[PDB]
Design a protein around this ligand. Structure first.
Ligand code: FAD
Ligand code: FAD
Ligand code: NAP
Ligand code: NAP
Lengths: 490, 490
């Protein structure tokens, strides 16, 4: 009877994963994907946040900043480089957009080969088992399905303040900005703000981060503070405990000139400065309010906008599932959405019973000095297991590659958190250093096997590689021992 | 009736570890370390092979090569770099030697602080519990100890051929070469040869590798071949199944000109070419023949020169121990020698029972495209567990960072080897790609916890990071499925 076995609302990370996997079982599948424009009119193609305005262009721009560092390092390794290489914003974003565009077309082609109907249209439920697809020109069409997957992700939140929508940009706009941002104010202090401030400084821009309260709420606060200090020592300026109150345009331009006014968080003080660009990185809102959930009876958390879901990704309505960023109490990460989507299609059409495991999922912040972790933060381990049952082994280290450029000794830092009640099970893993992500992935695998501290110590390091530090952590926070190099021992 | 509790012969990786650890227990310790010069008169300072003529300078030169690549990549990411950056050998080796020099002094200081007597002198046993230290000027002194640790390492092997000692250089000489090597022949095909051929090409030299038989004997042969093909594609020329027969000098110089003659391995064919530098990387010999082992009754394997040892690093003579490269049937790696040395001191003076675990020790080859691995090679897993009990999951991948420079798709490769008789225990782990070492270290930890294929698949990747490929290997070699990108799916 129904038009499709499965209609997927949203063609991002989770959505496309679910589609590609469901297509393996010869089912009629349709992906609806539509990108509503930013307040400034920015649009993009198929593939979701990660592909167009997230991980992909972010890491590419991170890379652009790393390369700036590599240019300086090269002098000391014998490359006869002149004194300063200038960076060119427009050339960079052109390359980035070029890659993105080929991902856009890669997916469009992938869907076609897998025989998945792709409809570039906004999905909205109209009643049980029925959905309306409104296309770009306003034309509607109604479709029915046996099952639905909500995979609509989130969008950047604005402040409630005068001028923010008309003058500020968000990450959605940053990655295809047609001109160089110039002097920038980044408002916010989580992974988006820090990563962006990070690479904008790295390519040579004057950058300021305005912080409401703490850096990286949710992450290990000592790690967060170390990332903060590093950014401060390498250019990025920080304004602590201030929130903007208005953004007014002094001059239009590409970039123009903007006057930002901010109020203290605890006092009455006021500050003004002017910038070329104000980037808002102050959280994201779930796209669940305008997809007609009332008409099919799907319950969402009204305050947060997230969708509560069974451990099988089922909503309260038996035939409607949800995946990715919109899920209540989950994690907002591409590979999680992809795994969730893939395993869902497996359970539905492949007779699998494998659920998606959301415990100890590794993450990485691509701040100038990268931060990789997995498991519990120190504070959370203490909360969960009790202060005197936790042992923290830690150490600084110095990447061999930095010795010859002769920079940044005792900045990189590694800690493992152990549960003394459980054979010193490693319940948290943290690294601050180059290629933090590469380092962390493997250790996340070991956490899944219940790695103990004596198993860790019995693993031999690879030399000379930063990651080897973890096989030799012998100094505890409790012992109070010194952990500075150099060091230079055996 | 002892001067010292422990005399360590050799102040390398293992020796210095054992010394630093033994010193924790307030024992009288002496390190003897002397560097006998290369045939060309090269020597160096405290620290052993790894510090002076191995891991450290090798990685630093590898880094010089990667930075060459980074200069090229930077153009696409918007850095207005001109067309060619020349490299300067003398400036590079100055920086490298500088760092090495500070490690030399670092250790010399570390030993002094730890109250370890350091004697820059050649050790030679003269009789039970007695050793002779011959210093640089030929002055002898006799010392006694309750225990001795032999930690003397190895030295480059030469060929049995005319001109090799007088005209060729080895790794011992390479890292402090006072002039640029120019057009180079590397003889040999294991980790030393390929690593060196690698970075010499990377800094812009004309490089030829001459191979006797196969590449990287002992490592997974398919991995070896891939490394080989990559090197061929990126400059390095290979001469297959040839062995040099003589090296004659055409002209002295810095570099001079050398005429190398080589004979086919299976036919009668002869080839001549001329080079600026011939680098011999054809194995190393244990320094165990000239340390007076006869006089104390220590048994060595006569053919190989290695010392057989109990699982506690004890020789047949109860009071004499051996560590590091000289050990029979072990592995010749810095962190192994360090661990062995550190744990030995723990057993002897710390009442520990923890032995050094030599199974599944991760290694990395720093060829231009790095190769990391841990556990068994495919062929060894088949030999050990039987062909139809092995499942190999594998995939090519394309580092996000390479997409914008737009190079080298489908070169990086990952595979895991699983035992079907043992819940698909991952028994071998192989990766070819950037930061291979960083990726591998963590997975080596997981192998110590008996990581299974399903545990692997339940671990969520970090996006976008190369290492994440391992969380999603779904195509087996047995299935015959295609594994080429791009691809681009969900
Ligand atoms: C700046 C930034 C950096 C990030 N860095 C990382 C990182 O390094 N690593 C990582 O793992 N994650 C990162 N993330 C998070 C990651 O991108 C998201 O968690 C992931 O893309 C979520 O996937 P999803 O399928 O839930 O939503 P999305 O991928 O956003 O998919 C949503 C799709 O549905 C469309 N849509 C919405 N409503 C409708 C509708 N009604 N009808 C039709 N289509 C609709 C949207 O336009 C979008 O295409 C980053 C995010 C940002 C913003
Ligand atoms: C080019 C090259 C690259 C390498 N790359 C890596 C790598 O990336 N990773 C890795 O883990 N390993 C690498 N290795 C191997 C590693 O460096 C060695 O395994 C390690 O140094 C061995 O430690 P050791 O303490 O056994 O011997 P060594 O470190 O060599 O110590 C031996 C010391 O004893 C001295 N000595 C010898 N005889 C006497 C005597 N009779 N009296 C006094 N002193 C004496 C020697 O001069 C030397 O200083 C590399 C080796 C080479 C040659
Ligand atoms: C994807 O996640 P994401 O990194 O974009 O965001 P996120 O992880 O949800 O966190 C929002 C970040 O922005 C800050 N923030 C939130 N509202 C703000 C406001 N109204 N004014 C100033 N700062 C504000 C938060 O600080 P707080 O820690 O003070 O909430 C935090 O640093
Ligand atoms: C530290 O280890 P390392 O990498 O220096 O060496 P290694 O790991 O002991 O291996 C020696 C390498 O040099 C080659 N080789 C050995 N003797 C040779 C000879 N007489 N002529 C030409 N090539 C020879 C070996 O080839 P084979 O594989 O043919 O032994 C191998 O490629």
């Amino acid at each position: 009877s129904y038009d499709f076995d499965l209609i997927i609302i949203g063609g991002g990370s989770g959505g496309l994963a679910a589609a590609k996997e469901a297509a393996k079982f010869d089912k009629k599948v349709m992906v609806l994907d539509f990108v509503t424009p930013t307040p400034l009119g920015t649009r993009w193609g198929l593939g979701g946040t990660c592909v167009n305005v997230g991980c992909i262009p972010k890491k590419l721009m991170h890379q652009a900043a790393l390369l700036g560092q590599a240019l300086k390092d090269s002098r000391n390794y014998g490359w006869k480089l002149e004194d300063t290489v200038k960076h060119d914003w427009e050339k960079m974003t052109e390359s980035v957009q070029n890659h993105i565009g080929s991902l856009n077309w890669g997916y469009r082609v992938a869907l076609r080969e897998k025989k998945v109907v792709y409809e570039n249209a906004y999905g909205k439920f109209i009643g049980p088992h029925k959905i309306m697809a409104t296309n770009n020109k306003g034309k509607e069409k109604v479709y029915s399905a046996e099952r639905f997957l909500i995979a609509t992700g989130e969008r950047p939140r604005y402040l409630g303040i005068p001028g923010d929508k008309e003058y500020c940009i968000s990450s959605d706009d940053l990655f295809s900005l047609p001109y160089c941002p110039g002097k920038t104010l980044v408002v916010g202090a989580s992974y988006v703000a820090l990563e962006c401030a990070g690479f904008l400084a790295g390519i040579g821009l004057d950058v300021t981060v305005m912080v409401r309260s703490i850096l990286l709420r949710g992450f290990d606060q000592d790690m967060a503070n170390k990332i903060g200090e590093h950014m401060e020592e390498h250019g990025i300026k920080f304004i602590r405990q201030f929130v903007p109150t208005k953004i007014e345009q002094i001059e239009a331009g590409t970039p123009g000139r903007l006057k930002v006014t901010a109020k203290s968080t605890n006092s009455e003080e006021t500050i003004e400065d002017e910038f070329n660009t104000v980037l808002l990185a102050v959280g994201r809102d779930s796209c669940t309010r305008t997809i007609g959930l009332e008409t099919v009876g799907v319950k969402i958390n009204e305050k947060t906008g997230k969708i509560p879901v069974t451990d099988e990704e089922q909503t309260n309505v038996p035939y409607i599932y949800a995946i990715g960023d919109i899920l209540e109490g989950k994690l907002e990460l591409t590979p999680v959405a992809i795994q969730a989507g893939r395993l869902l299609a497996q359970r539905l059409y492949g007779g699998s019973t494998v659920k998606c495991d959301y415990d100890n999922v590794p993450t990485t912040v691509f701040t100038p000095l990268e931060y990789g972790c997995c498991g519990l933060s120190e504070e959370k381990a203490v909360e969960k297991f009790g202060e005197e049952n936790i042992e923290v082994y830690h150490s600084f280290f110095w990447p061999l590659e930095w010795t010859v450029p002769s920079r940044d000794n005792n900045k990189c830092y590694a800690k493992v958190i152990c549960n003394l009640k459980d054979n010193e099970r490693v319940v948290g893993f943290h690294v601050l250093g180059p290629n933090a992500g590469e380092v962390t992935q493997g250790f996340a695998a070991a956490l899944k096997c219940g790695l103990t501290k004596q198993q860790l110590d019995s693993t031999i390091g690879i030399h000379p590689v930063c990651a080897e530090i973890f096989t030799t952590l012998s100094v505890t926070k409790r012992s109070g021992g010194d952990i500075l190099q150099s060091g230079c021992x055996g």
